[PDB]
Amino acid sequence: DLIERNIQRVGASLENGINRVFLTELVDNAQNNHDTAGSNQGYQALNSAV
């Protein structure tokens, strides 16, 4: 069913768009930052960000 396929593509394509807008905002406009400086990335970076 090509109309169902294309309905699925149109849906997924828009959802991807939502996700782009979301992620771009989320990354660009966070007021806080944890500079890992190539080290202690992982749990310590997550905990430091919290």
6 binds other proteins (CB under 8 A): no
Identity at 5, one-letter amino acid code: R
E-assigned strands of the chain? none
Positions in 1-50 near Mg ion (CB under 5 A): 32
Q: How far is the CB of 11 from other proteins (least distance, A)?
A: 41
Query: Does residue 37 belong to the site contacting other proteins (CB under 8 A)?
Result: no
The Cα–Cα gap between 34 and 46 comes to 9
The residue (of 32 and 39) whose beta carbon lies closer to Mg ion is 32
Contacts with other proteins, residue ranges (CB under 8 A): 39-42
